[PDB]
Structure 1
């Protein structure tokens, strides 16, 4: 058996041209960043992973290398189930907080342990997980069409993504609801009924404006309403789902561990769980959340937005899971989607395929890694939520 010898966290940053920066309720994007986790062993088998973002890269590096890492040195990396609980109970729940950047830090390390296990077996992760459910491929959506567009501009962007071969795309809303509505109406008129239109408010609305928005999403035939309210208001999400519309209420990028999703389920407050393998606790935890969603006759469609590793880790689980695919694919300017690894966007009839090599299924460009060390750049400007909080 192997022994883990080191847990490393490489802070990386890549720039975005000013005119390509986009804004949602999460804030104005400034640089696309990540931590590349590397777990090394005594026989030279290495796994890599990512704890998503944006968080703060110094906080993630310290958590991974100095809080979680020590609990792993000397251990057999094959016992990923044991190591997840050893780290959660030993340190991270109490000492970084139970719904925290520490859970995202664990997620990066858990993805690297799964990558390491697939490489040790010479199999792609989806094969360990029981092989494909989606044998034809996984239906993707273009993420996303951002704020600051007129309705003809939002419809032209959607149409462009449809032309590139997507069959679905997502619009960010929440700052100017009359304008969001006009964007949706123009987008639906442009593409017709077979392209799916998803909407994401990044927690920017209150309950009454979310109810008014849901009526427009229902009229426009939208597939889901993501983060319509603060993730802290579970009853508001039940109220939106209780309207009985065909529009799914979706959340989960900012909820952590299966415990959060069980509280939404128990309160009849969710249709689509969006737990991200790279944020909500790892592949090990997202596996459990996907199964709990199916048990409650709901769907799991992860958030995937940060880098090609968070995309690939979720894509292995989505391909192996019995849920309808609605697979998030970042189409914004992001070198971590094109230059870190050899696995790229390739759509055929609106579907992507999981990488096919061992582990996550591709190799890292270590020369790109070495050239993009973080030097203190910010990832994202201040996020929103003060308006709906009540600040004029």
Structure 2
């Protein structure tokens, strides 16, 4: 057997050229940052992970190394299930909060344990999970077309991603619903019916404005309506879904553990569960959520947006899952997507394939890591919702 010797959190920051900084309800992007989790063992098998973002890097590092870490030192890393519960019940739930940055921290560590397990077995994670369902590849969408655009500019950006091979893309909405509607109508007109258009309000609307927007989305044949309302307003999501349109009500990037999603399902409030393996509790928890969605005849299509590790962790799960694919691919300026590891975006007929090596299935460029240590830069401006 192996024993865990260290749990490390490397805080990393990468710059965004001013002209490339985008804003949504979540805030204006400043720097693309991450924690790279490293779980090390006595025999030298190592796994890495990421607890996503934006979350404060010092908070994440402290939680990972000094709250979670001590629960892992000396333990056999093979018992991922045991360790998830030891950590959640022993420290994280009460001492960081049950729906919290602590759960994202746990997620990064869980992903590292799965990477470690795959590497120890010399197998890609998706093979551990019963192999592929999506044998030909996984349909991706370009994320996203952000705020501050004219209708023709928005349509131009969409045409651009479609040219690159994408069969679907997502539009940010919320700040100015009349502009959102104009943008959406121009975009649909430009690409026709063969391209799926997703919309994401980042919790920015109230119920009545969301009902008004849903009518537009329905007219435009939008695939889903993501975070239409505060995640705290479950009944509001039920009301939207009860309209019975072909537009899916989607949420989950800010909901944590299977428990949050159970509450939405129980209240008939959700069509697409978006639990991110790197946020909602780990690969371990995302697996459970995906299964629970299928039991209820609903879909699981994760949020994946932060770095190439959060993308890869989710992609292994998605490739293995029978849910129809609508896989989020961050197309914004992001060095953490392109330079962190040996794995890049390759679309074939609009599909991506998970990395094929052991564990997460690629190698970290530790030179890049050594060159991008965080020195206190902020990741994102203040969010909206006030």
Is the aligned partner of 1:80 residue 2:96?
Answer: no
- Distance between the aligned counterparts of 1:218 and 1:369, measured in 2? 45
1:328: Cα distance to partner? 0.2
Alpha-carbon offset, residue 160 of structure 1: 0.0
Structure 1 CA distance for aligned equivalents of residues 327 and 206 of structure 2: 27
Give the deviation of 1:69 after TM superposition: 0.2
Shift of 1:54: 0.2
2:2 counterpart SS class: coil
Q: Following the alignment from structure 1 to structure 2, what is the Cα–Cα distance between the partners of residues 218 and 95?
A: 43
Distance across 1 between alignment mates of 2:272 and 2:204: 19
- Could you tell me how far apart the structure 2 residues matched to 1:188 and 1:23 are? 22
CA distance in 2, matches of 1:99, 1:23: 25
Task: Report the CA distance between 1:281 and its aligned residue.
Answer: 0.1
Partner Cα distance (1:187, 1:136) in 2: 29
Provide the secondary structure at the position in 2 that maps to 1:358. Answer: coil
- What are the superposed Cα offsets for residues 156-208 of structure 1, whole Å, 9 maximum, x if unpaired? 00000000000000000000000000000000000000100000000000000
Which residue of the partner structure matches residue 384 of structure 1? Answer: 384
Deviation at 1:313, TM superposition (A): 0.1
Q: C-alpha deviations, 1:58-99, integer Å up to 9, x for none?
A: 000000000000000000000000000000000000000000
Given the alignment of the two structures, is residue 60 of structure 1 paired with residue 66 of structure 2, yes or no?
A: no
3-state secondary structure, aligned to 1:329: strand
SS at match of 1:159: helix
Q: In 2, Cα distance between the equivalents of 1:324 and 1:281?
A: 22
Distance 1:382 1:94 in 2: 27
Q: Could you tell me how far 1:377 is from its partner in structure 2?
A: 0.3
CA-to-aligned-CA distance 1:305-328 (integer Å, 9 cap, x gap) = 000000000000000001000000
1:232, distance to aligned residue in structure 2 (A): 0.2
What are the ranges of 5 or more consecutive residues in structure 1 without an aligned counterpart? 387-392
Number of residues paired by the alignment?
386
1:116 and 1:307 map into 2 onto residues whose CA distance is 19
Please give the secondary structure, in 2, of the residue aligned with 1:54.
coil
Q: Secondary structure at the match of 2:384?
A: coil
Q: Matched residue of 2:139: which SS?
A: strand
Please give the per-residue CA displacement for 1:111-150, whole angstroms capped at 9, x wherever unaligned: 0000000000000000000000000100000000000000
Q: Distance in 2 between matches of 1:194 and 1:66?
A: 50
Separation in 2 of the partners of 1:222 and 1:289? 24
In the aligned structure 2, how far is the partner of 1:236 from the partner of 1:182? 25
Indicate whether 1:174 and 2:174 are aligned. yes
Q: Which residue of 2 aligns with 1:19?
A: 19
Determine the C-alpha separation between the residues in 2 that align with 1:373 and 1:279: 22
- Name the SS of the counterpart of 1:328 in structure 2: strand
For 1:372 and 1:213, locate their aligned partners in 2 and report how far apart those are by CA, in whole Å: 41
Distance 1:154 1:82 in 2: 48
Structure 2, unmatched stretches of 5+, are none
| Helix, strand or coil at the partner of 2:265 | helix
Q: Post-superposition shift, 1:5?
A: 0.2
Runs of 4+ in 1 over 3 A off after TM superposition: none
Find the aligned partners of 1:151 and 1:236 in 2 and give their Cα distance. Answer: 29
TM-score, normalization by structure 2 = 1.00
Q: CA deviation at 1:291?
A: 0.1
Q: Does 1:195 align with 2:195?
A: yes
Q: Match of 1:7, SS? A: strand
TM (normalized to structure 1)? 0.98
Tell me which residue corresponds to 2:374: 374
Distance between the aligned counterparts of 2:39 and 2:199, measured in 1?
37
Q: Distance in 2 between matches of 1:293 and 1:325?
A: 14
SS at the partner of 1:186? helix
